[PDB]
Write a protein that binds this ligand. Structure first.
Ligand SMILES: Nc1ncnc2c1ncn2[C@@H]1O[C@H](COP(=O)(O)OP(=O)(O)O)[C@@H](O)[C@H]1O
Ligand SMILES: Nc1ncnc2c1ncn2[C@@H]1O[C@H](COP(=O)(O)O)[C@@H](O)[C@H]1O
Ligand code: ALF
Ligand SMILES: [Mg+2]
Length: 203
């Protein structure tokens, strides 16, 4: 089974993907997590991607396409979390998979309004050593866990990221609808309820 999680920044895609992957054995491919690792390591990819990410812009397609060619699991279940994020990325994914006799089985759209997105992102905090994600209101970190606010979760950068999503990523909703594989979830609900809806799709 190959899944794509699609939706605005802060919709809860990572939160749900991490759980589904552990509980059901999917390989989790988060382009954001992988890119943040590259930046830390200072690889050619990381050094180039950094300033796009800091501005809330997308990293250029060719870099992301190469990244996915390099890490795409040969066999077994996969969740692509935050990839694809452009039409050209989605076209590349389809081509890659077809060469392997595979296809995307379901694309889960995490629907949530802007006001909710903005609250989730402005209260998001991360453990920079593990990538674990918390929320100051909805899931605060316990004692002993040092967390930070991502630079891209600043108010002006959140604004830009939502703009970028609407212009470049939201067209994927129609791209996948027209493949017959889009499934809608209400990602504005609390975490447990979102997860129930995820399980319903993949079942
Ligand atoms: N259903 C939910 N309700 C409330 N807060 C949530 C929910 N899902 C995730 N969060 C919190 O909202 C923020 C965004 O979640 P995250 O999984 O990082 O989203 P994404 O991967 O889509 O950008 C995080 O701070 C997370 O703790
Ligand atoms: N598929 C992608 N294409 C382009 N840039 C991406 C992609 N995934 C992550 N990014 C970059 O990483 C940032 C964080 O994304 P994420 O961690 O998925 O919320 C984005 O705002 C982009 O700068
Ligand atoms: F996957 Al995001 F901000 F959209 F961590
Ligand atoms: Mg994420």
């Amino acid at each position: 089974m190959i899944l794509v999680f699609l939706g605005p920044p802060g919709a809860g895609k990572g939160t749900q993907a991490k759980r589904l992957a552990k509980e059901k054995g999917f390989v989790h491919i988060s382009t954001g997590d992988i890119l943040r690792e590259a930046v830390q390591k200072g690889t050619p990819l990381g050094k180039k991607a950094k300033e796009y990410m800091e501005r809330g812009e997308l990293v250029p397609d060719d870099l992301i396409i190469a990244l996915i060619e390099e890490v795409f699991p040969k066999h077994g279940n996969v969740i692509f979390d935050g990839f694809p994020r452009t039409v050209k990325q989605a076209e590349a994914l389809d081509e890659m998979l077809e060469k392997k006799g595979l296809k995307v089985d379901h694309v889960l759209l995490f629907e949530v309004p802007d006001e909710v997105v903005i609250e989730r992102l402005s209260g998001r905090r991360i453990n920079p050593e593990t990538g674990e994600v918390y929320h100051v209101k909805y899931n605060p970190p316990p004692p002993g866990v040092k967390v930070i606010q991502r630079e891209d979760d600043k108010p002006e950068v959140i604004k830009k990221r939502l703009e970028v999503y609407r212009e470049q990523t939201a067209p994927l909703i129609e791209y996948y609808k027209k493949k017959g594989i889009l499934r809608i979830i209400d990602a504005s609900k609390p975490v447990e309820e979102v997860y129930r809806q995820v399980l319903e799709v993949i079942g």
